[PDB]
């Protein structure tokens, strides 16, 4: 900001940008004609992705290789990443390609490294006060892409939930699932909705000396690809946190392993928030279960 331009810009490196008539100024200036931004919410890229939400894997591997070509084909190139606050969905693009253009080799390292340059957090609180759960997962899917799959999506995993367990119950809601909701979205649209009290799409159990609830869920259209699931409540207490819900979590079928998926609490969205930690204990845990499909 000494040459006097006030933008809430972020050289995360020399040639990776992140950022929130000024704007157009800076880059006619610093950068001309050796720019590319891409536009989170005609040298722009644009990928709408949700406040708190992921790109879905493929959004991902269509920016890697959009970033890659521009990258590689000049050196004084530079990408510029730019967001409503340029945090969550901003940091998910930036690590992606940091681990693709092999400054890190870990997600965790990427992440860390994009909270400690982007923020004032530094290092420690980087996890849940820039990203969501979901957010670091999917750029561990995408570690996971690079070093197991060649860069490419994995085989195609079709799926269906059949069952839903929730652990840690007592005080969350009404302490019994009696108000609790699953809402199962998938590209863009809901695919089921199970109302656990009532019995609709599902059957509760309610298990006081495990604490936990497990529903049987029915009639689970077959699941493919990148999976958003909801949980809503009619009770006072259970607070909504980001996504208008109490709480949330984004996973791709053709990731899942064996028959289920387990989400522990800081692997859950909204619950990975240390204010929450009073409603959600340290053995709250969504696990999903699935048959093939």
């Given at each position: 900001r000494k040459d006097g331009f006030d933008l809430d810009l972020t050289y995360v490196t020399d040639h990776v940008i992140a950022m929130s008539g000024e704007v157009s100024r800076f880059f006619k200036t610093k950068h001309p004609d050796k720019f590319r931004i891409y536009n989170l919410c005609n040298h722009v890229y644009r990928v709408m992705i949700d406040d708190h939400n992921v790109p879905t894997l493929v959004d991902l591997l269509k920016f890697i290789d959009d970033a890659k070509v521009w990258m590689t084909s000049d050196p004084d190139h530079v990408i510029a990443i730019?967001?409503?606050?340029?945090?969550?969905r901003t940091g998910t693009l930036v690590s992606s390609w940091l681990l693709e253009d092999g400054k890190f080799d870990t997600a965790k390292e990427?992440?860390?490294?994009?909270?400690?340059?982007?923020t004032d957090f530094e290092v420690g609180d980087v996890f849940q006060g820039v990203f969501t759960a979901s957010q670091i997962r999917y750029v561990g899917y995408f570690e996971k892409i690079k070093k197991n799959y060649g860069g490419q999506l994995p085989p195609m995993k079709k799926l269906k939930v059949t069952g839903v367990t929730i652990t840690a119950?007592?005080?969350v809601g009404r302490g019994n699932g009696?108000?609790?909701?699953?809402?199962i979205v998938s590209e863009r649209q809901e695919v089921l909705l199970c109302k656990f009290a009532e019995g609709y799409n599902c059957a509760l159990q309610y298990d006081a000396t495990d604490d936990c609830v497990t529903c049987e869920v029915k009639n689970c259209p077959v699941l493919a690809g990148d999976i958003k699931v909801r949980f809503m409540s009619t009770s006072k207490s259970l607070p909504r946190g980001y996504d208008n819900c109490p709480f949330y979590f984004w996973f791709n079928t053709s990731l899942v392993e064996g028959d289920h998926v387990t989400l522990k609490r800081e692997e859950i969205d909204n619950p990975h928030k240390?204010?929450?930690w009073k409603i959600y204990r340290d053995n709250f845990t969504v696990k999903l279960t699935f048959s093939d499909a």
């Open positions: 730019h967001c409503k606050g340029g945090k969550g990427a992440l860390e490294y994009f909270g400690s340059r982007r119950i007592q005080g009696s108000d609790l909701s699953m809402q240390k204010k929450t």
